[PDB]
Design a protein around this ligand. Structure first.
Ligand SMILES: CCCCCCCCCCCCCCCCCC(=O)OC[C@H](COP(=O)([O-])OCC(O)COP(=O)([O-])OC[C@@H](COC(=O)CCCCCCCCCCCCCCCCC)OC(=O)CCCCCCCCCCCCCCCCC)OC(=O)CCCCCCCCCCCCCCCCC
Ligand SMILES: CCCCCCCCCCCCCCCCCC(=O)OC[C@H](COP(=O)([O-])OCC(O)COP(=O)([O-])OC[C@@H](COC(=O)CCCCCCCCCCCCCCCCC)OC(=O)CCCCCCCCCCCCCCCCC)OC(=O)CCCCCCCCCCCCCCCCC
Ligand SMILES: CCCCCCCCCCCCCCCCC[C@@H](O)O[C@H](CO[C@H](O)CCCCCCCCCCCCCCC)COP(=O)(O)OCC[N+](C)(C)C
Ligand SMILES: CCCCCCCC/C=C\CCCCCCCC(=O)OC[C@H](COP(=O)(O)OCCN)OC(=O)CCCCCCC/C=C\CCCCCCCC
Ligand SMILES: CCCCCCCC/C=C\CCCCCCCC(=O)OC[C@H](COP(=O)(O)OCCN)OC(=O)CCCCCCC/C=C\CCCCCCCC
Ligand SMILES: CCCCCCCC/C=C\CCCCCCCC(=O)O[C@H](COC(=O)CCCCCCC/C=C/CCCCCCCC)COP(=O)(O)OCCN
Ligand SMILES: CCCCCCCCCCCC(=O)SCCNC(=O)CCNC(=O)[C@H](O)C(C)(C)COP(=O)(O)O
Lengths: 178, 128, 103, 459, 603, 88
């Protein structure tokens, strides 16, 4: 999620992803813990038979018939964690996520309550404001000519600098705002 | 061997079952690198416009304007009378009208004939 | 694999900034500064403000307005059985035909 | 009837002589007072009509339309007061003058004891609307829209005038009362067929019919908020009023000639309801919904039964109010967003809950939820069509299903989901917008208590 | 005078006071849910009086209080019907709703908009009470639409979730499909019987034709989620557990069945519609049970069980036993609501975990939920002298001892077996094995609200069947004589299902793994009906709505015919006429030609 | 919910507990900053098994792109703390 994607997936990444999917779907098939442990160790042994293989064409032939076999026996109703992109509580709390700038439109009678919070917010806004001009310059001087090649942002290199484009990553509402 | 999965329009081919992915080549790698470079440039532009504290408005999205304009205002100037278009327009704009006209006309002539012969039993039929 | 050193440093800085923001989200003990300004017993009052008054209003509206017009309230004409007597008339429904009673 | 017309005429001098910062207040107050005055026309009789004089008369079909027309002006002023803030005093007074002239023309049109006077006012209502659309419009296409909104209308209305005068040469009077009392059957002839067409298509073009509905999306999209309100709420009902007034002399030729228009409306309601499903514009979607509802009204009028007429009147009133509310909500979104696209701004219920409630109520009343008068009119028309022929129920039910689908689609796309991240200029809704929504919605839920007030003369 | 009317209107009237007070100050405090729960409990204990009067005397009423618009010879008025059905269903619904709000007090403890949730629940209850007591078709339609709109609002309670909005729109779509038939029935009844009142409709239809009954059957299939329009009920589990327990399990989803109960005088005079109803119920219950017996989400299993019970109710209606179907509604509300409450308690205890693969040993970890779920499953499958027996046993006997179709009876028996199968599946997979939840144990039941709400419905699910069966008057001829084997058909079928499903489930412990068969894939994917029917039609509609309706006709051909052709013709004629080079020779020659033509043509 | 507000101390305690139950690692040789591929001599498949253990222990699944580049327990606790927004 946080880490920037790569231009492509290597063979080891693909085999690791297949291993993850196969073990998860095997756990979905094998409800009980001991049965899952036995069959997962059996699957690990089946996977590590060809670990030391060197031929790239034969390696590509491998993992492909494995993906086909996985698709044939992929447990059409697999287990999904509640907050996962397929879970029952994937986006339950997205209706309670309110942006930070909404507080700028509060009535003064509402800002009369919670004065310390708005003072700290003022310090945060000043820090963002002073910081922003420098961040743009860093991005301008650090970005390779011809535009970025990978959507990875550099860290702050000086003392008083801050990571470029940090405001909307630091100011996420919450995971469970209410 | 196992039974083969057959792709369809509403059930597309899985990502891990595409024969094209496993046919890796330097040209394909270069194409993917260029695609990711384009995506990275667009994302960098969007974030530069997004994190700016001075901005107090929406960020105009030329893709969205292009989509809406092509959907609404760019249809007729690119239209050409073609046997496909002429036939499809005639069908979908004339056939249903005549079909429903025939259906309702047949039903109403049947009802009128039954009324004229008097064998309809319209007792308690007061509101119309 | 793993994090690159620049990724490590950026994650560290962003994480410390996020922790500072989260700590700043907390409330002081005086934060809700509420300004004050004005201008069996629970069940006992509830049963008279939520039941008794609605029954009074509905009973009045039914007995004195709805029943004024004809056919607004129609009964079922309760069942009449042999051996019963009617209050209005006082006459007694005659008994049945004395079928043979056995088991 | 002059007790309503004269104050509307005095609204002009008052606006011009009004202080440079007090035009809106005076206009709103006096327009609301005039609406209160016009409320008295609802007291109708089971007898003929309220014949005030030789020139103007009232009826229980004209009375609800007159009340709605008088009520719309304060809402139009409240909606227009927002986007005309940076505008010079003379031109704001000109805008208010156009609104007042349109209201006066509509009020005189809805009484119109004579058909030539009705035609004159019915075509006089065109000029202020065209000026409003082509002057105070945002996009460059407004001019084109105006042209369309003009010529279509005239393309239908010029033959009507000829037919009208021809009738006066044969009948001898175009007065509605004499025309009703001295009506004679139309022989099935080519000349009578063409006279029927000349009398009918003028009102069919403004409803609009499915074939002749092209001008409406353009006119509604490019017009300002007040123009959209007046077009959707009142100007579409002129065709229905004219048809109900003029179909008396068209019998018995109406039975044969109603078939093409009945088929066109019964299929175009489905076509426009389906078009609403795939739409990237809020105003266009509302316009197509208006087209569908007016197609149902056309079916009702062509069926020509008492239940048909009652449902038609109720549906016109309800649709006017509902479409005005929907356009107002869309304009409130646009004034913050400046894009007028459904998919751009999302999840507004999180940021504006009360406006989300207003959106929900508007969508529900457009969905024809009972016991709203929308449902009353729809059900009366459906029952009359079923009596006309039992097979219409399939198309009617399909239309109801697609209507519910696109209404809830409009609600969910704009109110539910996750908010757009980069949009930060979404300020809290003002008291004016909320008051506009409340003043739009409360009359509907009050009229559902007294349906007979809007059921027309055949009640 | 005659307190029956005053009480039976006062219950519904006092059900609406918290809606009035929702704009008051109490709505902004945390005592609002307690206010609503107390109001509902008082309404239930107040409605217990008309039930007592009916049981004593058999007293029935019609209260036509307010006069709405009158349309020529048709009169519309606010009329309430207080027959056996209304005065019996109101107390059960109020009891279930009281239990549901008491449970939601604890289940929605952390929800910021809990007062709005309770207001929505009360509004749904008000709309359902309007639906049940309606005496004319317009008021019944008002309730029909109110319950649907409230279901739409409550399914999409978490409006930030895409799937919740999708499920709400799905439910609206299917309910409008039923609305088509409902409106058809209304139109036919007004056109032919000249009224929407129940009395006039019953009087003027001695032999009811096919069309109004087919419309009523379509509406009932739409609202009760029969086989043709089933998937919306499984998909409605996206809403909060109290919503699934109240609306989509016990009260709202029976409404369509109730409709067919209301028109039973017209139902018995038609044979084709009865056969259609019986076949639809049989196929629905079979298909839903078969889909249920292989699901992993507990809420999905309970919803499919509810749909199977609805199919059984429709079969009972089809075999000309409306009163028995009403009794089944009454018992099913009790035990299915309590079952859903147990499911919600388990769900909350395991940190919002719904799949049964992560639920292990709970027989000892949570005992009260265990005993409540066991009692509920026993009542649902049918244990003699329990609340489910007095209904389902008579259902089976009536099906066996009457002139029906063989296939419908076979599918009813197989559906009973599959009901036992999924009940034992739930119990085995959720209560018997070793624990499989995450290590951080947060299991807790020490809360009086949940315990009281569950135990009230427990006492109901144990005693209410006997009390109600022995209290109501006899409404049908009993099957007093029976074959000995056919007397025990339901019991042996249920026991066989229990034993076979337990034996099949016990083989999961075996250290052997085999790929699934085609039948398992068909049953797990809901017969593949949700895939095809939610991908093939919709696309084929939406595409058309942009290709033919929007672009081809509206934007191109309708534009080409009238405006564009006129513009092109006028432009061409203007160009031709105005393009004169200014040479007087050509104009003079044209004038000479015109003079010659005038001299040679106009004389 | 009624869920206690877990802290990084608890998260690191649970992570180290899960790693100590891993019999392939000697508990007395493991450390908070101990690397997986080098300091503990673990294969990539063992790393993804550790990721699975963390997912089944914390009740949420880490995306594969983030999981495949987590190399020490300290980064795992840091990532989980960022995911759950842990204060102290
Ligand atoms: C039911 C009995 C009622 C008796 C009490 C009287 C109540 C009078 C209310 C009249 C209508 C309200 C005015 C409309 C604008 C809303 C005002 C507002 O902004 O709210 C702010 C206010 C404060 O909220 P907040 O916390 O500050 O803001 C948070 C956000 O706004 C977030 O907002 P939210 O999430 O809280 O949502 C607001 C809420 C409420 O907002 C609304 O959406 C109101 C819409 C209601 C109807 C929708 C249109 C459909 C057409 C129906 C037409 C019937 C009208 C009858 C005559 C009405 C007279 C004016 O929305 C809903 O709950 C959904 C309602 C859908 C119900 C569908 C069933 C319809 C038919 C029901 C039967 C009616 C006839 C019965 C005949 C047989 C029995 C005798 O909220 C309220 O006051 C809620 C109102 C109470 C609920 C009313 C819903 C049922 C009433 C139906 C009409 C009246 C029936 C008359 C007798 C019935 C017996
Ligand atoms: C007159 C005397 C009366 C007495 C008669 C005799 C008494 C009873 C005799 C017993 C007869 C059979 C009973 C055994 C049932 C089978 C259970 C079984 O072994 O399942 C495992 C086995 C496969 O397991 P798996 O794939 O390895 O699953 C992996 C794990 O187990 C995954 O496991 P999991 O943890 O995920 O979940 C486990 C779950 C998942 O298991 C499943 O996958 C369920 C799927 C099969 C079971 C469903 C059986 C219900 C049959 C209703 C069909 C109605 C007609 C449908 C028409 C379809 C047309 C294509 O299994 C269960 O929980 C229990 C399943 C249901 C068994 C208990 C109730 C059934 C007994 C009642 C049947 C008749 C007695 C009625 C009594 C009334 C007196 C008349 O199922 C089968 O091999 C199928 C066996 C029978 C299926 C017949 C349908 C075949 C349709 C093909 C085409 C046919 C021609 C159509 C031509 C159309 C052209 C137009
Ligand atoms: C484009 C979007 C919609 C716009 C509006 C469209 C609706 C307008 C259509 C008008 C309705 C049809 C016009 C005439 C209908 C009369 C009935 C006729 O169709 O039936 C037969 C008529 O026979 C033939 O139709 C003869 C006419 C054929 C010539 C018409 C052209 C046909 C297609 C042209 C359509 C173009 C219309 C739009 C022009 C701009 C019956 O034969 P007969 O009993 O002997 O005649 C009875 C009438 N009498 C008694 C007066 C003599
Ligand atoms: C409340 C506060 C006051 C409490 C003290 C007063 C107690 C009751 C005494 C009031 C006097 C009786 C009364 O109200 O008059 C009846 C009066 C109407 O007069 P009628 O002549 O009978 O009928 C109209 C035709 N002329 O009835 C009322 O208006 C009050 C009660 C009516 C029912 C309540 C309204 C609820 C339903 C709202 C409408 C719902 C939509 C339409 C229904 C659709 C049904 C198909
Ligand atoms: C007998 C003769 C009948 C004459 C009927 C006249 C119909 C009224 C419309 C006349 C428009 C003719 C002019 C025209 O179209 O010019 C093309 C013009 C080019 O644009 P310009 O601004 O002139 O210049 C751009 C380049 N700088 O195209 C347009 O813009 C037209 C846009 C608006 C079209 C108006 C709508 C007309 C169609 C509506 C129905 C009327 C049809 C006629 C009657 C139908 C028969 C009953
Ligand atoms: C939005 C665009 C819609 C355009 C509307 C056009 C439809 C109206 C019909 C065409 C115009 C006809 C106007 C006639 C006015 C009524 C007068 C009348 O009917 O009197 C007839 C006259 O009838 C006619 O002359 C009509 C002839 C039509 C001439 C103009 C043709 C215009 C185009 C016709 C084709 C289109 C037909 C359908 C158009 C529908 C619109 C799409 C009797 O004549 P007498 O000599 O007095 O009889 C003595 C012997 N008994
Ligand atoms: C119920 C679901 C059924 C699913 C069925 C799935 C069937 C699986 C069968 C698998 C068959 C194979 O072995 S396919 C074998 C694919 N080819 C290779 O593995 C060659 C080189 N392998 C690598 O480089 C890896 O990364 C490795 C060294 C292993 C680790 O590396 P790390 O050092 O970075 O951990």
């Amino acid at each position: 999620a946080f880490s920037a994607p790569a231009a492509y997936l290597t063979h080891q990444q693909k085999v690791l992803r297949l291993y993850k999917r196969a073990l998860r779907h095997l756990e979905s098939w094998c409800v009980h813990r001991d049965k899952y442990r036995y069959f997962a160790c059996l699957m690990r042994a089946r996977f590590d038979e060809h670990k030391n293989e060197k031929d790239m064409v034969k390696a590509t032939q491998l993992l492909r018939q494995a993906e086909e076999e996985f698709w044939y026996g992929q447990h059409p109703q697999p287990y999904i964690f509640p907050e996962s992109p397929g879970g029952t509580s994937y986006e339950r709390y997205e209706c309670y996520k309110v942006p930070e700038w909404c507080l700028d439109d509060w009535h003064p009678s509402e800002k009369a309550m919670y004065p310390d919070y708005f003072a700290k917010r003022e310090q945060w806004k000043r820090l963002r404001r002073e910081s922003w001009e420098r961040e743009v310059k860093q991005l301008q001087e650090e970005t390779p000519p011809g535009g970025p090649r990978t959507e990875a942002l550099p860290p702050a290199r000086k003392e008083g600098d801050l990571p470029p484009l940090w405001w909307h990553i630091v100011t996420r509402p919450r995971e469970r705002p209410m | 061997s196992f039974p083969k999965y057959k792709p369809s329009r509403l059930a597309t081919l899985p990502a891990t079952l595409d024969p094209a992915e496993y046919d890796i080549s330097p040209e394909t790698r270069k194409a993917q690198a260029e695609r990711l470079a384009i995506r990275s440039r667009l994302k960098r532009e969007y974030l530069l416009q997004y994190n700016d504290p001075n901005r107090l408005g929406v960020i105009e999205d030329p893709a969205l304007i292009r989509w809406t304009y092509a959907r609404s205002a760019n249809i007729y100037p690119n239209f050409r009378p073609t046997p496909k278009t002429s036939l499809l327009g005639a069908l979908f704009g004339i056939g249903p009208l005549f079909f429903w006209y025939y259906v309702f006309k047949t039903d109403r002539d049947k009802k009128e004939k039954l009324i004229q012969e008097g064998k309809l039993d319209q007792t308690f039929n007061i509101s119309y | 694999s793993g994090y690159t050193p620049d990724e490590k440093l950026r994650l560290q800085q962003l994480r410390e900034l996020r922790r500072r923001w989260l700590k700043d989200q907390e409330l002081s003990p005086r934060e809700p500064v509420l300004p004050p300004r004005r201008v069996t017993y629970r069940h006992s009052i509830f049963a008279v403000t939520h039941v008794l008054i609605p029954v009074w209003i509905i009973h009045y509206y039914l007995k004195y307005h709805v029943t004024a017009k004809p056919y607004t309230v129609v009964e079922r004409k309760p069942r009449i059985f042999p051996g019963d007597t009617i209050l209005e008339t006082g006459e007694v429904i005659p008994l049945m035909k004395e079928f043979p009673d056995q088991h | 009837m002059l007790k309503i017309i004269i104050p509307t005429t005095m609204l002009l001098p008052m606006t011009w002589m009004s202080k440079h910062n007090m035009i809106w207040i005076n206009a709103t107050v006096h327009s609301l007072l005039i609406s209160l005055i016009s409320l008295s026309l609802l007291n109708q009789l089971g007898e003929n009509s309220l014949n005030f004089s030789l020139t103007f008369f009232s009826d229980s079909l004209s009375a609800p339309l007159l009340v709605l027309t008088t009520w719309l002006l304060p809402l139009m002023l409240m909606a227009s007061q927002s986007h005309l803030s940076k505008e010079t005093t003379t031109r704001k007074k000109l805008y208010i003058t156009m609104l007042i002239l349109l209201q006066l023309f509509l009020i005189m049109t809805f009484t119109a004891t004579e058909l030539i006077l009705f035609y004159i006012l019915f075509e006089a209502t065109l000029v202020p609307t065209l000026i409003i659309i082509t002057r105070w419009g945002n996009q460059t296409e407004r001019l084109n829209a105006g042209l369309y909104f003009l010529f279509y209308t005239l393309a239908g209305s010029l033959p009507l005038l000829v037919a009208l005068v021809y009738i006066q040469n044969t009948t001898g009077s175009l007065n509605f009362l004499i025309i009703h009392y001295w009506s004679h059957p139309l022989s099935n002839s080519w000349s009578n067929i063409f006279m029927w067409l000349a009398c009918i298509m003028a009102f069919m073009v403004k409803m609009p019919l499915y074939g002749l509905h092209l001008w409406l999306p353009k006119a509604h999209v490019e017009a300002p908020i007040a123009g959209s309100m007046v077009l959707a709420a009142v100007l579409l009902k002129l065709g229905g009023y004219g048809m109900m007034r003029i179909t008396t002399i068209l019998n018995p030729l109406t039975n044969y000639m109603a078939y093409p228009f009945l088929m066109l409306s019964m299929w175009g309601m489905i076509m426009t309801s389906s078009i609403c499903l795939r739409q990237t514009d809020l105003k266009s979607l509302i316009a197509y919904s208006s087209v569908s509802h007016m197609a149902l009204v056309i079916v009702a009028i062509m069926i020509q039964t008492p239940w048909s007429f009652m449902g038609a009147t109720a549906l016109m009133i309800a649709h006017g109010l509902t479409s005005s509310m929907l356009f107002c909500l869309a304009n409130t979104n646009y004034e913050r967003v400046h894009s007028r696209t459904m998919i751009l701004a999302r999840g507004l219920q999180t940021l504006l809950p009360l406006m989300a409630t207003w959106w929900l109520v508007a969508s529900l009343t457009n969905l024809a939820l009972p016991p709203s008068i929308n449902l009353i009119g729809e059900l009366f028309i459906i029952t009359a069509s079923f009596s006309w022929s039992n097979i219409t129920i399939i198309l009617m039910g399909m239309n109801m299903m697609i209507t519910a689908l696109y209404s809830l689609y409009m609600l969910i796309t704009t109110q539910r989901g996750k908010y757009t991240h980069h949009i930060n200029n979404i300020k809290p809704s003002f008291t004016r917008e909320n008051a506009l929504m409340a003043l739009h919605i409360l009359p509907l839920l009050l009229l559902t208590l007294n349906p007979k007030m809007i059921l027309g003369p055949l009640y | 005078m005659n307190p029956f009317a005053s009480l039976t209107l006062t219950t519904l009237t006092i059900l609406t006071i918290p809606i009035m007070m929702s704009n008051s100050n109490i709505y902004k405090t945390n005592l609002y849910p307690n206010y609503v729960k107390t109001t509902v409990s008082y309404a239930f204990t107040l409605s217990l009086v008309p039930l007592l009067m009916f049981m004593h005397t058999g007293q029935e009423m019609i209260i036509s209080n307010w006069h709405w618009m009158t349309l020529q010879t048709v009169e519309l008025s606010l009329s309430f019907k207080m027959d056996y059905f209304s005065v019996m269903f109101i107390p059960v619904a109020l009891f279930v709703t009281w239990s549901i709000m008491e449970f939601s007090m604890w289940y929605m403890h952390s929800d910021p908009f809990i007062n709005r949730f309770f207001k929505y629940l009360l509004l749904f209850l008000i709309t359902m009470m309007i639906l049940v007591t309606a005496n004319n078709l317009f008021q019944l339609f008002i309730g029909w639409e109110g319950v649907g709109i409230m279901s739409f609002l409550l399914i999409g309670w978490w409006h930030g979730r895409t799937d919740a909005n999708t499920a709400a729109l799905q439910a609206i779509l299917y309910n409008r499909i039923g609305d088509i038939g409902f409106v058809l029935s209304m139109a036919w009844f007004l056109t032919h019987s000249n009224a929407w009142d129940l009395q006039q409709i019953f009087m003027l239809n001695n032999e009811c034709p096919n069309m109004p009954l087919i419309g009523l059957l379509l509406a009932a299939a739409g609202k009760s989620a029969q086989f043709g329009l089933h998937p919306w009920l499984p998909s409605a589990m996206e809403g909060p557990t109290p919503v699934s327990a109240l609306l989509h399990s016990s009260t709202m989803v029976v409404a369509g069945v109730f409709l067919l109960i209301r028109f039973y005088p017209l139902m018995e005079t038609n044979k084709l519609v009865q056969t259609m109803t019986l076949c639809l119920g049989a196929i629905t219950t079979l298909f839903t049970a078969l889909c249920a017996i292989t699901q992993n989400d507990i809420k999905k299993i309970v919803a499919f069980s509810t749909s199977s019970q609805l199919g059984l109710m429709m079969v009972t209606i089809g075999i000309n036993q409306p009163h028995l179907a009403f009794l089944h509604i009454c018992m099913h509300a009790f035990f299915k609501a309590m079952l859903f409450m147990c499911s919600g308690s388990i769900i909350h205890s395991l940190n919002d975990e719904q799949d049964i693969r992560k639920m292990g040993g709970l027989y000892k970890a949570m005992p009260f939920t265990t005993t409540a779920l066991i009692i509920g499953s026993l009542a649902l499958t049918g244990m003699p002298y329990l609340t489910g027996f007095y209904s389902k046993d008579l259902i089976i006997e009536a099906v066996n001892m009457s002139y029906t179709n063989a296939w419908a009876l076979l599918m009813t028996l197989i559906a009973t077996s599959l009901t036992a199968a999924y009940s034992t599946r739930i119990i085995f997979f959720a209560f018997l094995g070793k624990p499989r939840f995450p290590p951080l144990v947060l299991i807790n039941e020490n809360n009086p609200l949940l315990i009281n709400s569950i135990k009230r419905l427990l006492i109901g699910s144990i005693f209410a069947g006997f009390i109600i069966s022995n209290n109501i008057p006899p409404m049908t001829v009993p099957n007093t004589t029976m074959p000995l084997y056919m007397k025990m058909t339901a019991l042996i079928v249920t026991i066989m299902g229990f034993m076979l499903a337990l034996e099949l489930n016990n083989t999961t412990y075996y250290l052997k793994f085999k790929y699934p068969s085609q039948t398992y894939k068909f049953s797990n994917m809901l017969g593949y009906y949700p895939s095809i029917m939610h991908r093939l039609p919709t696309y084929h509609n939406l595409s058309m709505s942009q290709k033919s309706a929007s672009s081809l006709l509206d934007l191109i051909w309708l534009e080409t015919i009238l405006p564009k052709t006129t513009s092109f013709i006028q432009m061409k004629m203007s160009i031709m006429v105005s393009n004169q080079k200014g040479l007087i020779k050509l104009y003079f020659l044209s004038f000479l030609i015109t003079i010659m033509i005038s001299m040679t043509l106009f004389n | 919910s009624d869920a206690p507000p877990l802290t990084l101390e608890a998260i690191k305690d649970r992570v180290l507990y899960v790693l100590k139950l891993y019999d392939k690692i000697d508990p007395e040789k493991l450390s908070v900053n101990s690397h997986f591929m080098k300091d503990l001599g673990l294969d990539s498949l063992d790393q993804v098994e550790i990721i699975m253990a963390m997912e089944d222990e914390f009740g949420f699944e880490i995306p594969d792109i983030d999981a495949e580049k987590l190399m020490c327990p300290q980064e795992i606790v840091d990532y989980i703390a960022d995911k759950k927004d842990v204060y102290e």
